[PDB]
């Protein structure tokens, strides 16, 4: 297909578990659709999750009621490169917005294979036969993505080994947790630690060998979600908050939200009754997957 990953591409995601940054749409675009977008999503009354009972879960799934997302998740520059990694019948299964405010704390280290990480229960299921996880993560820059705002960072070709172990809890407290500093970094999980998921309580991430992932406004990064990634803490020294548009993909036969129809975490609480997948690449999906084919106010999931 037009955007497909090059076989040199390939390899070099193979290896390192994230490839890129491409365009999806120019600085100057991205800014503009920004402006408008930002304000249209202050109205929640077509989100698909009305009563949050709070929480970080605000920020979820917003491309079931927005016209601009729901094109953005389907964009051919995003989902040629996803087929070339995850194959014929894709589905995005969910999208987050990760804000850093002026002064926030940077993401702390993680890595996700089952996505039980904060609720204590697993949200995506792949074929226990293999040794396949996680999710592809595509992280659009809505801002500029800069080291002192706050740019994602990356430990390469640590997504073949977790560090972590999802069955175990972690405590939400948000009180406690605001700029905590760990080995030299102010870093949090949205009102979690999560270096209580780790396998060794006394390893620690190899930040050493993190490299950043500087961004212009318009771009994406694709990564594996099983990637040990982070963000750096965004210092203040710019007035403008930085904006990433998370979009995660997995393969149509992976189960999605088996045996839920509600999740709890991040201090809140959802109804998945207006939740559905949305089938990006090819056109068959099995039956225990629901999917939606438009928004909430009726804008179908296509690129414009
Ligand atoms: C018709 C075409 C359909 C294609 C379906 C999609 C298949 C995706 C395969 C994959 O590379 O998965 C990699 C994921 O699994 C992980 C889980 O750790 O890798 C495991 O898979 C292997 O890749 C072949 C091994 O290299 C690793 O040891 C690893 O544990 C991480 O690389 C990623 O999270
Ligand atoms: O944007 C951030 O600070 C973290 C992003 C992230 O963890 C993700 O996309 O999975
Ligand atoms: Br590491
Ligand atoms: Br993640
Ligand atoms: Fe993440």
Redesign the pocket.
């Given at each position: 297909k037009k955007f497909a990953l090059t076989a040199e591409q390939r390899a070099s995601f193979?290896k390192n578990?994230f490839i890129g940054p491409f365009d999806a749409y120019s600085p100057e675009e991205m800014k503009e659709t920004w402006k408008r977008t930002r304000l249209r999503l202050l109205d929640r009354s077509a989100a698909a999750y009305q009563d949050l009972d709070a929480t970080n879960i605000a920020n979820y799934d917003r491309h079931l009621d927005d016209d601009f997302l729901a094109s953005h998740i389907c964009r051919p520059e995003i989902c040629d490169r996803v087929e070339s990694?995850?194959?014929?019948?894709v589905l995005c299964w969910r999208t987050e917005f990760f804000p850093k405010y002026p002064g926030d704390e940077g993401t702390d280290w993680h890595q996700a294979?089952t996505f039980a990480n904060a609720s204590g229960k697993p949200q995506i299921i792949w074929p226990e036969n293999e040794?396949?996880?996680?999710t592809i993560t595509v992280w659009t820059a809505f801002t500029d993505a800069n080291i002192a705002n706050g740019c994602l960072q990356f430990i390469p070709g640590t997504?073949?080994?977790?560090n972590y172990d999802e069955t175990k809890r972690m405590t939400y407290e948000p009180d406690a947790n605001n700029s905590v500093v760990k080995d030299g970094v102010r870093r949090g999980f949205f009102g979690y630690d999560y270096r209580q998921l780790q396998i060794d309580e006394n390893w620690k991430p190899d930040e050493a060998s993190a490299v950043p992932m500087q961004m212009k406004a318009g771009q994406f990064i694709i990564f594996?979600?099983?990637?040990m990634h982070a963000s750096y803490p965004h210092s203040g020294e710019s007035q403008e908050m930085r904006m990433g548009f998370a979009s995660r993909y997995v393969?149509s036969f992976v189960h999605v939200y088996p045996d839920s129809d509600h999740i709890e975490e991040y201090g809140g609480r959802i109804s998945l009754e207006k939740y559905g997948a949305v089938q990006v690449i090819g056109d068959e999906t099995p039956e225990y997957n629901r999917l939606v084919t438009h928004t909430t106010r009726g804008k179908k999931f296509e690129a414009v």
């Amino acid at each position: 297909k037009k955007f497909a990953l090059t076989a040199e591409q390939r390899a070099s995601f193979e290896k390192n578990g994230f490839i890129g940054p491409f365009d999806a749409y120019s600085p100057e675009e991205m800014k503009e659709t920004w402006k408008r977008t930002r304000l249209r999503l202050l109205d929640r009354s077509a989100a698909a999750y009305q009563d949050l009972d709070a929480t970080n879960i605000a920020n979820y799934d917003r491309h079931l009621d927005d016209d601009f997302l729901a094109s953005h998740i389907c964009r051919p520059e995003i989902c040629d490169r996803v087929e070339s990694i995850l194959g014929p019948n894709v589905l995005c299964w969910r999208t987050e917005f990760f804000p850093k405010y002026p002064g926030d704390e940077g993401t702390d280290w993680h890595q996700a294979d089952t996505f039980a990480n904060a609720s204590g229960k697993p949200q995506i299921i792949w074929p226990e036969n293999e040794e396949f996880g996680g999710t592809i993560t595509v992280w659009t820059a809505f801002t500029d993505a800069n080291i002192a705002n706050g740019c994602l960072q990356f430990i390469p070709g640590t997504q073949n080994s977790m560090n972590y172990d999802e069955t175990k809890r972690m405590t939400y407290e948000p009180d406690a947790n605001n700029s905590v500093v760990k080995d030299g970094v102010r870093r949090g999980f949205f009102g979690y630690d999560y270096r209580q998921l780790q396998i060794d309580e006394n390893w620690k991430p190899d930040e050493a060998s993190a490299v950043p992932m500087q961004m212009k406004a318009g771009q994406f990064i694709i990564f594996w979600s099983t990637l040990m990634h982070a963000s750096y803490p965004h210092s203040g020294e710019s007035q403008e908050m930085r904006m990433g548009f998370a979009s995660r993909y997995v393969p149509s036969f992976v189960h999605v939200y088996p045996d839920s129809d509600h999740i709890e975490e991040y201090g809140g609480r959802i109804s998945l009754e207006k939740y559905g997948a949305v089938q990006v690449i090819g056109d068959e999906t099995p039956e225990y997957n629901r999917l939606v084919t438009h928004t909430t106010r009726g804008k179908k999931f296509e690129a414009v």
